[PDB]
Coordinates of C-alpha atoms in Angstrom, one line a residue:
Chain A
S2 CA 23.6 -19.6 -34.2
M3 CA 20.9 -21.2 -32.3
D4 CA 20.2 -20.3 -28.9
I5 CA 16.8 -21.6 -28.8
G6 CA 16.7 -21.5 -25.0
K7 CA 16.4 -17.7 -24.6
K8 CA 14.0 -17.8 -27.7
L9 CA 11.6 -20.3 -25.7
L10 CA 12.2 -18.4 -22.3
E11 CA 10.8 -15.1 -24.4
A12 CA 7.8 -16.9 -25.6
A13 CA 6.9 -18.3 -22.3
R14 CA 7.5 -14.7 -20.7
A15 CA 5.1 -13.3 -23.0
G16 CA 2.4 -15.7 -23.0
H17 CA 2.8 -16.9 -26.5
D18 CA 1.9 -20.7 -25.8
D19 CA 1.8 -21.6 -29.6
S20 CA 5.5 -20.7 -30.2
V21 CA 6.6 -22.2 -26.9
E22 CA 5.3 -25.6 -28.1
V23 CA 6.7 -25.4 -31.7
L24 CA 10.2 -24.8 -29.9
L25 CA 9.5 -27.6 -27.6
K26 CA 8.6 -29.7 -30.6
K27 CA 11.8 -28.9 -32.5
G28 CA 13.7 -30.0 -29.2
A29 CA 14.2 -26.7 -26.9
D30 CA 15.5 -27.5 -23.3
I31 CA 12.6 -27.7 -21.0
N32 CA 14.8 -26.8 -18.4
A33 CA 16.6 -23.5 -19.9
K34 CA 17.3 -21.0 -17.3
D35 CA 17.4 -17.1 -17.4
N36 CA 20.3 -15.2 -15.4
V37 CA 18.4 -15.4 -12.5
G38 CA 17.5 -19.1 -12.6
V39 CA 14.0 -18.9 -14.1
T40 CA 12.7 -21.6 -16.1
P41 CA 9.9 -21.7 -18.5
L42 CA 7.7 -23.2 -16.1
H43 CA 8.2 -20.2 -13.5
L44 CA 7.2 -17.8 -16.2
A45 CA 3.9 -20.0 -17.1
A46 CA 2.9 -19.8 -13.5
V47 CA 3.3 -16.0 -13.1
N48 CA 1.5 -15.2 -16.3
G49 CA -1.3 -17.6 -15.0
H50 CA -1.2 -19.8 -18.3
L51 CA -2.8 -23.0 -16.6
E52 CA -2.9 -25.4 -20.0
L53 CA 0.8 -24.3 -20.7
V54 CA 1.6 -25.5 -17.5
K55 CA -0.3 -28.7 -17.9
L56 CA 1.8 -29.1 -20.8
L57 CA 5.2 -28.3 -19.6
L58 CA 4.6 -30.6 -16.4
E59 CA 3.4 -33.6 -18.5
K60 CA 6.4 -33.2 -21.1
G61 CA 8.8 -33.5 -18.1
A62 CA 9.7 -30.2 -16.6
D63 CA 10.7 -30.2 -12.7
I64 CA 7.8 -29.0 -10.5
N65 CA 10.0 -28.2 -7.4
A66 CA 12.8 -26.2 -9.3
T67 CA 14.1 -23.5 -7.5
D68 CA 15.6 -20.2 -9.2
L69 CA 18.7 -18.2 -7.9
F70 CA 16.7 -16.9 -4.9
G71 CA 14.9 -20.1 -4.1
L72 CA 11.5 -19.1 -5.5
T73 CA 9.4 -22.1 -7.0
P74 CA 6.5 -22.2 -9.4
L75 CA 4.0 -22.3 -6.5
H76 CA 5.7 -18.9 -5.3
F77 CA 5.0 -17.1 -8.6
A78 CA 1.6 -18.5 -9.0
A79 CA 0.6 -17.5 -5.4
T80 CA 2.0 -13.9 -6.2
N81 CA -0.4 -13.4 -9.3
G82 CA -3.5 -15.1 -7.5
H83 CA -4.0 -17.5 -9.9
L84 CA -6.3 -20.0 -7.6
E85 CA -6.9 -23.0 -10.3
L86 CA -2.9 -23.0 -11.3
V87 CA -2.3 -23.2 -7.5
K88 CA -4.7 -26.1 -7.1
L89 CA -3.0 -28.0 -10.1
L90 CA 0.4 -27.5 -8.9
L91 CA -0.4 -28.6 -5.4
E92 CA -2.3 -31.8 -6.5
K93 CA 0.8 -32.7 -8.6
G94 CA 3.6 -32.6 -5.9
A95 CA 4.5 -29.2 -5.2
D96 CA 5.5 -28.4 -1.5
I97 CA 2.6 -26.1 0.2
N98 CA 5.4 -25.1 2.8
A99 CA 8.2 -24.3 0.4
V100 CA 10.7 -21.7 1.5
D101 CA 12.9 -19.2 -0.3
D102 CA 16.1 -17.8 0.6
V103 CA 14.8 -15.5 3.2
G104 CA 12.1 -17.7 4.7
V105 CA 9.3 -16.7 2.7
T106 CA 6.4 -19.0 1.8
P107 CA 3.6 -19.0 -0.8
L108 CA 1.0 -17.8 1.9
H109 CA 3.2 -14.9 2.4
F110 CA 2.8 -13.7 -1.1
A111 CA -1.0 -14.3 -1.3
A112 CA -1.2 -12.3 1.7
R113 CA 1.0 -9.6 0.5
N114 CA -1.0 -8.9 -2.7
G115 CA -4.5 -9.4 -1.3
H116 CA -5.6 -12.3 -2.6
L117 CA -8.3 -13.5 0.0
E118 CA -9.8 -16.6 -1.5
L119 CA -6.2 -18.0 -2.4
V120 CA -5.4 -17.6 1.5
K121 CA -8.5 -19.1 2.4
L122 CA -7.4 -22.2 0.0
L123 CA -3.7 -22.5 0.9
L124 CA -4.7 -22.0 4.7
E125 CA -7.4 -25.3 4.4
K126 CA -4.5 -27.3 2.7
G127 CA -1.9 -27.0 5.6
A128 CA -0.1 -23.8 5.2
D129 CA 1.3 -22.1 8.4
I130 CA -0.7 -19.1 9.2
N131 CA 1.7 -17.7 11.7
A132 CA 4.9 -18.8 9.6
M133 CA 7.6 -16.2 10.4
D134 CA 10.8 -17.1 8.6
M135 CA 12.1 -17.8 11.9
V136 CA 11.3 -14.9 13.5
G137 CA 10.5 -12.2 10.7
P138 CA 7.2 -10.7 9.0
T139 CA 3.9 -12.7 9.4
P140 CA 1.6 -13.2 7.0
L141 CA -0.6 -10.4 8.9
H142 CA 2.0 -8.0 8.7
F143 CA 1.9 -8.3 4.8
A144 CA -1.7 -7.9 4.9
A145 CA -1.6 -4.9 7.1
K146 CA 1.1 -3.1 5.2
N147 CA -0.9 -3.0 2.0
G148 CA -4.3 -2.2 3.5
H149 CA -6.2 -5.5 2.8
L150 CA -9.2 -5.1 5.4
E151 CA -11.3 -8.3 4.6
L152 CA -7.9 -10.5 4.7
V153 CA -7.1 -9.1 7.9
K154 CA -10.1 -10.0 8.9
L155 CA -9.9 -13.5 7.8
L156 CA -6.4 -14.1 9.3
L157 CA -7.6 -12.9 12.7
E158 CA -10.6 -15.1 12.8
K159 CA -8.0 -17.9 11.9
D160 CA -6.2 -16.8 15.0
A161 CA -3.1 -15.1 13.9
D162 CA -1.5 -13.4 16.5
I163 CA -2.5 -9.6 16.4
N164 CA 0.5 -8.3 18.2
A165 CA 3.5 -10.5 16.8
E166 CA 6.8 -8.8 16.2
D167 CA 9.0 -8.7 13.0
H168 CA 12.6 -8.1 13.1
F169 CA 12.6 -4.7 14.0
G170 CA 10.1 -5.1 17.1
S171 CA 7.2 -3.7 14.5
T172 CA 3.4 -5.0 15.2
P173 CA 0.7 -5.0 12.3
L174 CA -0.8 -1.9 14.1
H175 CA 2.7 -0.1 13.2
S176 CA 2.8 -1.2 9.6
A177 CA -0.8 0.0 9.2
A178 CA -0.1 3.3 10.8
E179 CA 3.3 3.8 9.0
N180 CA 1.4 3.2 5.6
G181 CA -1.9 5.5 6.6
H182 CA -4.6 3.2 6.4
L183 CA -7.6 4.5 8.3
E184 CA -10.0 1.9 8.4
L185 CA -7.6 -0.8 8.8
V186 CA -6.3 1.0 12.1
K187 CA -9.7 1.4 13.2
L188 CA -10.4 -2.4 12.8
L189 CA -7.2 -3.4 14.6
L190 CA -8.0 -1.1 17.4
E191 CA -11.4 -2.7 17.7
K192 CA -9.9 -6.2 17.7
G193 CA -7.5 -5.5 20.6
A194 CA -4.4 -4.2 19.0
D195 CA -1.8 -3.0 21.5
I196 CA -1.7 0.8 20.7
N197 CA 1.5 1.5 23.1
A198 CA 3.6 -1.4 21.6
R199 CA 7.2 -0.1 20.9
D200 CA 9.6 -1.2 18.3
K201 CA 13.0 -1.8 18.1
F202 CA 13.9 2.1 18.5
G203 CA 11.0 2.8 21.0
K204 CA 8.8 4.1 18.5
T205 CA 4.6 3.8 19.0
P206 CA 2.2 3.5 16.1
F207 CA 1.3 7.2 16.8
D208 CA 5.0 8.4 16.2
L209 CA 5.1 6.3 12.9
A210 CA 2.1 7.8 11.9
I211 CA 3.6 11.3 12.5
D212 CA 6.8 10.3 11.0
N213 CA 5.5 9.6 7.7
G214 CA 3.0 12.4 7.5
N215 CA 0.0 10.7 8.0
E216 CA -2.0 12.9 10.8
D217 CA -5.5 11.8 10.2
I218 CA -4.7 8.5 11.6
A219 CA -2.4 10.3 14.1
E220 CA -5.5 12.0 15.5
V221 CA -7.5 8.6 15.4
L222 CA -4.5 7.1 17.5
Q223 CA -4.8 9.9 20.1
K224 CA -8.4 9.9 20.6
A225 CA -7.9 6.2 20.9
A226 CA -5.3 6.7 23.6
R227 CA -6.9 9.4 25.6
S228 CA -10.7 8.6 25.5
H229 CA -12.2 8.2 29.1
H230 CA -14.0 10.8 30.8
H231 CA -13.7 9.9 34.5
Chain B
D4 CA -25.0 19.8 25.5
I5 CA -25.5 21.9 22.5
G6 CA -21.9 21.5 21.2
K7 CA -21.5 18.0 21.0
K8 CA -25.1 17.5 19.5
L9 CA -24.5 19.9 16.8
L10 CA -21.1 18.1 16.2
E11 CA -23.0 14.7 15.9
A12 CA -25.5 16.1 13.8
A13 CA -22.7 17.3 11.1
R14 CA -20.9 14.4 11.4
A15 CA -24.2 12.2 10.6
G16 CA -25.5 14.2 7.9
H17 CA -28.5 15.6 9.5
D18 CA -29.1 19.2 8.0
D19 CA -32.0 20.1 9.6
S20 CA -30.7 19.0 13.0
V21 CA -27.9 21.3 12.2
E22 CA -29.9 24.5 11.5
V23 CA -32.4 23.7 14.7
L24 CA -29.1 23.6 16.9
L25 CA -27.9 26.5 15.0
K26 CA -31.1 28.7 15.9
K27 CA -30.7 27.2 19.4
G28 CA -27.9 29.1 19.6
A29 CA -24.9 26.2 19.4
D30 CA -21.4 28.0 18.2
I31 CA -21.1 27.6 14.4
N32 CA -17.2 27.3 15.1
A33 CA -17.3 24.8 18.4
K34 CA -14.4 22.2 18.5
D35 CA -13.9 18.7 19.8
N36 CA -10.7 17.6 21.6
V37 CA -8.7 17.4 18.3
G38 CA -10.1 20.7 17.3
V39 CA -12.2 19.7 14.6
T40 CA -15.4 21.8 13.6
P41 CA -18.8 20.9 12.0
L42 CA -17.6 22.1 8.6
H43 CA -14.8 19.8 9.0
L44 CA -16.9 16.8 9.5
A45 CA -19.2 18.0 6.6
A46 CA -16.3 17.9 4.4
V47 CA -15.0 14.4 5.6
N48 CA -18.4 13.2 4.8
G49 CA -19.2 15.0 1.6
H50 CA -22.4 16.7 2.6
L51 CA -22.3 19.5 0.0
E52 CA -25.5 21.1 0.7
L53 CA -24.6 21.3 4.4
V54 CA -21.3 22.6 3.5
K55 CA -22.8 25.3 1.5
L56 CA -25.4 25.9 4.2
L57 CA -22.7 26.1 7.0
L58 CA -20.4 28.4 5.0
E59 CA -23.6 30.9 4.5
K60 CA -24.2 30.7 8.0
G61 CA -20.7 32.1 9.0
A62 CA -18.4 28.8 9.3
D63 CA -14.8 29.5 9.0
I64 CA -13.4 28.0 5.6
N65 CA -9.6 28.0 6.6
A66 CA -10.1 26.6 10.3
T67 CA -7.2 24.1 11.5
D68 CA -7.8 21.3 14.0
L69 CA -5.2 20.1 16.4
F70 CA -2.8 18.9 13.7
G71 CA -3.1 21.7 11.5
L72 CA -5.7 20.2 9.0
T73 CA -8.5 22.1 7.1
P74 CA -11.7 21.1 5.8
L75 CA -9.9 20.9 2.3
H76 CA -7.5 18.5 3.7
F77 CA -10.2 16.1 4.8
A78 CA -12.6 16.5 1.5
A79 CA -9.3 15.7 -0.7
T80 CA -8.5 12.7 1.6
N81 CA -11.9 11.1 0.9
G82 CA -12.0 12.0 -2.6
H83 CA -15.0 14.4 -2.7
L84 CA -14.4 16.3 -6.0
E85 CA -17.4 18.4 -6.4
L86 CA -17.1 19.5 -2.7
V87 CA -13.3 20.4 -3.3
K88 CA -14.4 22.4 -6.2
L89 CA -16.9 24.5 -4.1
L90 CA -14.6 25.1 -1.4
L91 CA -11.8 26.4 -3.5
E92 CA -14.3 28.7 -5.2
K93 CA -15.3 30.2 -2.0
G94 CA -11.8 31.0 -0.4
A95 CA -10.3 27.7 0.8
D96 CA -6.4 27.9 0.2
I97 CA -5.2 25.0 -2.1
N98 CA -1.8 24.6 -0.6
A99 CA -2.5 24.9 3.3
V100 CA 0.0 22.8 5.3
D101 CA -0.6 21.0 8.4
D102 CA 1.8 20.7 11.4
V103 CA 4.4 18.6 9.4
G104 CA 3.9 20.1 5.9
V105 CA 1.2 18.1 4.2
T106 CA -1.1 19.3 1.7
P107 CA -4.3 18.3 0.2
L108 CA -2.5 16.8 -3.0
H109 CA -0.5 14.6 -0.6
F110 CA -3.4 13.1 0.9
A111 CA -5.3 12.8 -2.5
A112 CA -2.2 10.9 -4.1
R113 CA -2.0 8.9 -1.0
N114 CA -5.6 7.5 -1.4
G115 CA -5.5 6.9 -5.0
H116 CA -7.9 9.6 -6.4
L117 CA -6.8 10.3 -10.0
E118 CA -9.4 12.7 -10.9
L119 CA -9.2 15.0 -7.7
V120 CA -5.2 15.1 -8.0
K121 CA -5.8 16.0 -11.9
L122 CA -8.1 18.8 -10.8
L123 CA -5.9 20.0 -8.0
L124 CA -3.0 20.4 -10.3
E125 CA -5.2 22.4 -12.9
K126 CA -6.2 24.7 -9.7
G127 CA -2.3 25.7 -9.0
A128 CA -1.4 22.8 -6.5
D129 CA 2.6 22.4 -5.9
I130 CA 3.2 18.7 -7.2
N131 CA 6.6 18.9 -5.8
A132 CA 5.7 19.9 -2.1
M133 CA 8.4 19.4 0.5
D134 CA 10.9 18.1 -2.3
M135 CA 14.2 17.0 -0.9
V136 CA 13.5 17.3 2.8
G137 CA 10.0 15.3 3.3
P138 CA 7.5 12.9 1.7
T139 CA 6.2 14.3 -1.8
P140 CA 2.9 13.4 -3.4
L141 CA 5.1 10.9 -5.2
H142 CA 6.3 9.2 -2.2
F143 CA 3.0 8.7 -0.9
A144 CA 1.6 7.3 -4.3
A145 CA 4.5 5.2 -4.8
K146 CA 4.5 3.6 -1.6
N147 CA 0.8 2.5 -1.9
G148 CA 0.8 1.0 -5.6
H149 CA -1.1 3.6 -7.5
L150 CA 0.5 3.0 -11.0
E151 CA -1.5 5.5 -12.9
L152 CA -1.5 8.2 -10.4
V153 CA 2.5 7.8 -10.6
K154 CA 2.4 8.0 -14.4
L155 CA 0.2 11.3 -13.9
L156 CA 2.6 12.7 -11.3
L157 CA 5.8 11.9 -13.5
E158 CA 4.1 13.3 -16.7
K159 CA 3.9 16.8 -14.8
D160 CA 7.5 16.6 -13.6
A161 CA 7.4 15.1 -10.1
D162 CA 10.8 14.6 -9.0
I163 CA 11.7 11.0 -9.4
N164 CA 14.7 10.9 -7.1
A165 CA 13.5 13.1 -4.0
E166 CA 14.7 11.7 -0.5
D167 CA 12.4 12.1 2.4
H168 CA 13.6 13.0 5.8
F169 CA 15.1 9.3 6.2
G170 CA 16.9 9.5 3.1
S171 CA 14.3 7.3 1.3
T172 CA 13.5 7.4 -2.3
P173 CA 10.1 6.5 -4.4
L174 CA 11.9 3.4 -5.4
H175 CA 12.8 2.4 -1.8
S176 CA 9.1 2.9 -0.9
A177 CA 7.7 0.6 -3.7
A178 CA 10.5 -1.9 -3.2
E179 CA 9.8 -2.3 0.5
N180 CA 6.2 -2.4 0.1
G181 CA 6.6 -5.0 -2.9
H182 CA 4.9 -3.0 -5.6
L183 CA 6.4 -4.9 -8.7
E184 CA 4.7 -3.2 -11.7
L185 CA 5.4 0.1 -9.9
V186 CA 9.3 -0.6 -9.6
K187 CA 9.5 -1.8 -13.2
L188 CA 7.8 1.8 -14.2
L189 CA 10.3 3.7 -11.8
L190 CA 12.9 1.8 -13.8
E191 CA 11.8 2.4 -16.9
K192 CA 11.6 6.3 -16.2
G193 CA 15.4 6.6 -14.4
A194 CA 15.0 6.1 -10.8
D195 CA 18.5 5.4 -9.3
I196 CA 18.9 1.7 -8.0
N197 CA 22.1 2.6 -6.5
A198 CA 20.3 5.4 -3.8
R199 CA 21.1 4.4 -0.5
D200 CA 19.0 5.8 2.8
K201 CA 20.2 6.9 5.8
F202 CA 20.9 3.4 7.1
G203 CA 22.9 2.6 3.9
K204 CA 20.4 0.3 2.5
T205 CA 19.7 0.4 -1.5
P206 CA 16.1 -0.8 -2.7
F207 CA 17.6 -4.2 -3.0
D208 CA 18.6 -4.3 0.2
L209 CA 14.9 -3.2 1.5
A210 CA 13.3 -5.8 -0.9
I211 CA 15.4 -8.6 0.8
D212 CA 14.7 -7.1 4.4
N213 CA 11.2 -7.3 3.7
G214 CA 11.0 -10.9 2.1
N215 CA 10.1 -9.5 -1.3
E216 CA 12.3 -11.8 -3.6
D217 CA 10.5 -11.0 -6.8
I218 CA 11.4 -7.4 -6.5
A219 CA 14.8 -8.3 -5.6
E220 CA 15.3 -10.4 -9.0
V221 CA 13.8 -7.3 -11.1
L222 CA 16.4 -5.1 -9.3
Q223 CA 19.4 -7.5 -9.7
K224 CA 18.3 -7.9 -13.6
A225 CA 18.4 -4.1 -13.9
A226 CA 21.7 -3.8 -11.9
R227 CA 23.5 -6.4 -14.1
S228 CA 22.0 -4.6 -17.1
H229 CA 23.8 -1.4 -16.5
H230 CA 26.9 -2.1 -15.2
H231 CA 27.9 1.2 -15.9

């Protein structure tokens, strides 16, 4: 009659801190888990409730706990861009280079969602800017696929390989072309991106732009390829 | 020479320069290497009065460049609403298609311009363009994380399960690009989580392949919720 764990989980999932503390006082398991192995700390991390995280951490919750797919609280906090929560977690034991079951690091997630400042912070505290799972998508790949311009500038300025390959031979210029990000394509061309690169199936960025219905981008790629009078 | 100077003048908004060059006898329908006209450039840059001028001075409103794009396409791409109204009111075709079947609505959706999409739909645009053979407006909005715009399109009966040429559905696109809240939304509205693309991959598979473990978790919870 007393499944207190799922109640605590639901309170953490919905930001209701007072209920979480009441249940904790009554003696709810601070390390309770849902079906995918997610703990209240994981949820406090995604929702960005800092003080709740402090409380859980001091009351004994495990900071390097991994859910079923190998995600840590740091991963989730990084996904939602909560800077001070990231700082706190780092300052009390979390591994900055933690890896999930497919080789993805927190920096990857910060890059994917366009959190520029958090990326700067992670890089200054030792994150690997060219972290591929072994060979997989790089942070720059993630930034390029989702159109995050300033972040691309930052990563390139911190010497990310502008021509790195993922598992399918794709470059960042491929990703940007496939998603129809015009200003980003211009930026990558301006910084020396390889316009003739072919993926594992022989496709150029131009080919992908056509395949995905982005004909303005395709235009730009064609002028880029042919612009030399003599 | 006069053609390129007229082109650069249109591309840079200098209207007085445009009329001087026209009087000097520049072809009002001149074309660069990708077939783009001064009207095209005025359209992409959102120079309304210039567009009115060129239109009064004889410019062709339905001219197509090298890939079949019209002035309306560029205006829709860059979100210039009032310019779109003006073009529509003097002859422009609302459902024009370029060489791969993409319409102005596709581009307005891809770039997240909510009001302009609302307007295009009010003026007769086809919400299900290339349904079930190629990318639809919903594909484009979903691939780039535009939540509100996806809500709008679904409310006006966009096909939530349409497949593009590679068998991909919108839920595929959202999963592979890691748009979490959009995946949740698509799940709530009946997207098929067991849909398989041309390579047999489900949205869950794509999420794994693209290093998106949070999206995969949500898909796992849905999958085990309705084991039906």
